[PDB]
Amino acid sequence: SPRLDCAGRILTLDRPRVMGIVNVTTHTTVEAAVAHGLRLAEEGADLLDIGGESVPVEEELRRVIPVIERLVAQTALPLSVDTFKPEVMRAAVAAGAGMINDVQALRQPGALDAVADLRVPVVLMHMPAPHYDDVVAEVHRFLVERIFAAEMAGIDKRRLLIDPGFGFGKSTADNVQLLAHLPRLCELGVPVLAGLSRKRSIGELTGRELPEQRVAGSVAAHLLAAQRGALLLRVHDVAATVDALTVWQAVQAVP
Amino acid sequence: PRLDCAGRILTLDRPRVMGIVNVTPDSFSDGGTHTTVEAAVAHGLRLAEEGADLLDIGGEAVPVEEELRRVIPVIERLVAQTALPLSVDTFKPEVMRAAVAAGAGMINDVQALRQPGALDAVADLRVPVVLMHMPAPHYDDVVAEVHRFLVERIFAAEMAGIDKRRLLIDPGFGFGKSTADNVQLLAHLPRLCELGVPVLAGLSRKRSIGELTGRELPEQRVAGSVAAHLLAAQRGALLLRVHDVAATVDALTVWQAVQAVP
Numbered sequence: 092s093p094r095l096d097c098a099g100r101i102l103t104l105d106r107p108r109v110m111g112i113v114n115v116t117t118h119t120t121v122e123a124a125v126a127h128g129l130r131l132a133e134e135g136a137d138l139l140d141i142g143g144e145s146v147p148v149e150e151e152l153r154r155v156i157p158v159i160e161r162l163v164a165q166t167a168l169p170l171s172v173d174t175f176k177p178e179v180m181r182a183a184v185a186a187g188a189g190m191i192n193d194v195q196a197l198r199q200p201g202a203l204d205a206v207a208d209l210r211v212p213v214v215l216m217h218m219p220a221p222h223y224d225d226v227v228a229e230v231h232r233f234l235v236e237r238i239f240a241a242e243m244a245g246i247d248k249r250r251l252l253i254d255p256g257f258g259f260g261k262s263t264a265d266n267v268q269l270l271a272h273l274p275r276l277c278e279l280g281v282p283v284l285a286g287l288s289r290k291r292s293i294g295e296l297t298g299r300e301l302p303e304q305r306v307a308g309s310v311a312a313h314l315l316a317a318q319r320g321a322l323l324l325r326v327h328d329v330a331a332t333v334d335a336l337t338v339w340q341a342v343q344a345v346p
Numbered sequence: 347p348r349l350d351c352a353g354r355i356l357t358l359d360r361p362r363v364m365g366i367v368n369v370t371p372d373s374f375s376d377g378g379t380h381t382t383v384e385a386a387v388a389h390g391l392r393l394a395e396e397g398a399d400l401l402d403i404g405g406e407a408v409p410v411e412e413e414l415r416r417v418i419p420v421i422e423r424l425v426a427q428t429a430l431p432l433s434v435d436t437f438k439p440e441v442m443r444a445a446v447a448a449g450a451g452m453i454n455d456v457q458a459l460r461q462p463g464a465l466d467a468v469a470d471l472r473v474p475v476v477l478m479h480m481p482a483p484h485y486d487d488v489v490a491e492v493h494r495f496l497v498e499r500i501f502a503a504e505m506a507g508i509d510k511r512r513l514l515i516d517p518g519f520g521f522g523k524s525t526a527d528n529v530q531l532l533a534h535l536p537r538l539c540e541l542g543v544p545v546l547a548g549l550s551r552k553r554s555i556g557e558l559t560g561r562e563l564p565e566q567r568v569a570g571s572v573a574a575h576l577l578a579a580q581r582g583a584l585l586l587r588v589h590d591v592a593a594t595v596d597a598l599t600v601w602q603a604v605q606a607v608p
């Protein structure tokens with residue numbers, strides 16, 4: 092099973108794990124984000140993903156660093172930094188972040204070299220909605236190219252995670268196709284992370300217009316993603332996703 | 347399966363949702379300004395708005411006269427205010443007959459027509475019937491024992507003149523079953539689907555869900571129940587008996603979208 096060394100905090104993917112979303116978009120903003128990350132840790136998150144973007148590096152650092160510093164001291168959970176900027180990647184890891192969550196899959200100038208030096212795990216996400224002749228084949232080809240580019244830069248394959256990037260330049264039909272064909276992405280030999288949390292495609296499938304109305308559909312999408320091979324799930328609704336996976340694990344355990 | 351619920355058709359081309367409507371004073375926040383009937387009707391209407399495919403009305407040891415007093419006015423009001431099929435959750439043939447006369451289109455029987463007169467009552471009514479298993483006792487093989495019991499009740503119903511096409515079966519999750527027995531039955535649910543009759547599963551906010559997730563209160567068991575019901579549908583169940591209708595509907599809709607991909 093994949094064993095991820097998140098700067099000393101081990102994340103073991105022997106079973107699907109839960110990555111709690113901590114959005115940090117001022118002391119009162121930092122305070123709210125830290126309290127939320129603590130709530131998600133109590134709800135059974137296996138990892139916290141800290142994001143301060145959607146902006147200049149120094150602004151992104153002002154938001155993310157105090158949250159990383161406080162959460163690394165107050166929780167024993169691995170911490171992920173959601174950024175595509177190499178200067179943020181280096182500074183966040185210096186602050187205590189144990190993983191890089193990169194929507195740009197190390198395509199920003201200097202990201203490859205920055206991460207090669209850090210020895211933390213890295214999520215290689217797909218983001219190009221454009222027309223796809225075959226979204227599954229195109230996402231697979233892109234992810235192969237990024238795995239190889241990371242390996243050529245000196246990043247050990249065992250530090251890699253991949254992600255189809257649900258909702259990034261993808262129609263509802265493209266997202267459903269990627270979820271249904273998720274086992275094809277699991278053949279790249281690297282753990283797959285799926286993030287469908289309260290996303291527009293969940294809302295379109297269920298007719299739920301607002302993010303918080305999409306919890307039931309998101310918990311179901313994440314259970315299906317885990318059934319189809321995903322080993323990490325990026326969610327807002329930690330306790331609910333934990334309960335869904337626990338029930339499924341009990342059923343799956345029956346010989 | 348196409349179930350004719352006294353004129354209201356329930357098509358089981360996909361897993362369907364049976365909304366739980368409990369007609370008991372205890373089931374509602376007793377402020378003291380609403381009647382029990384009024385609260386149960388409003389709840390059944392809310393579940394219909396949430397996308398329930400059928401409502402299951404239950405009044406229950408409850409004396410038969412009190413059971414009738416609870417379920418009948420609720421059935422009369424819901425049959426007029428919704429187009430959904432209505433199930434009556436009862437083991438008493440007097441309630442079965444009266445509920446069908448009031449507008450109920452299905453009988454949901456925890457006793458699988460074992461009460462004296464239930465076989466006769468159902469044979470005459472020509473409405474679908476749920477045959478549930480209820481004996482927690484020690485089981486040498488809970489799956490084999492539940493399967494045998496259900497075979498015997500299907501046979502008994504057919505021998506009484508009840509057309510096989512009007513039957514549904516149900517493993518009775520939580521009825522004389524440990525958490526381990528319930529998990530075993532859910533995991534081995536495809537074995538029950540081999541009997542050629544639609545399978546109903548009800549794990550809604552049940553103690554076993556609470557034990558699996560560490561959720562002490564019924565209302566904290568929603569996520570675990572929605573997951574159990576999705577797994578039951580993946581494993582062959584065509585009907586799901588739930589409190590959390592909108593949430594179960596959303597889970598099944600996402601799964602249907604994924605399943606539809608060739």
Ligand SMILES: Nc1nc2ncc(CNc3ccc(C(=O)O)cc3)nc2c(=O)[nH]1
Pocket residue numbers: 173192193194214216254256257258259284285286287289290291292325
């Ligand atoms: N690795 C990873 N990181 C992410 N970071 C932010 C986000 C947030 N992105 C959005 C994209 C689309 C939508 C949408 O509503 O479709 C909402 C948020 N997603 C992910 C993701 O899925 N994977």
Ligand SMILES: Nc1nc2ncc(CNc3ccc(C(=O)O)cc3)nc2c(=O)[nH]1
Pocket residue numbers: 435454455456476478516518519520521546547548549551552553554587
């Ligand atoms: N067909 C059918 N009807 C039912 N009626 C009442 C109930 C309520 N039964 C309970 C049994 C156990 C528990 C529990 O918490 O274990 C709660 C309710 N369940 C069903 C069911 O599963 N199937």
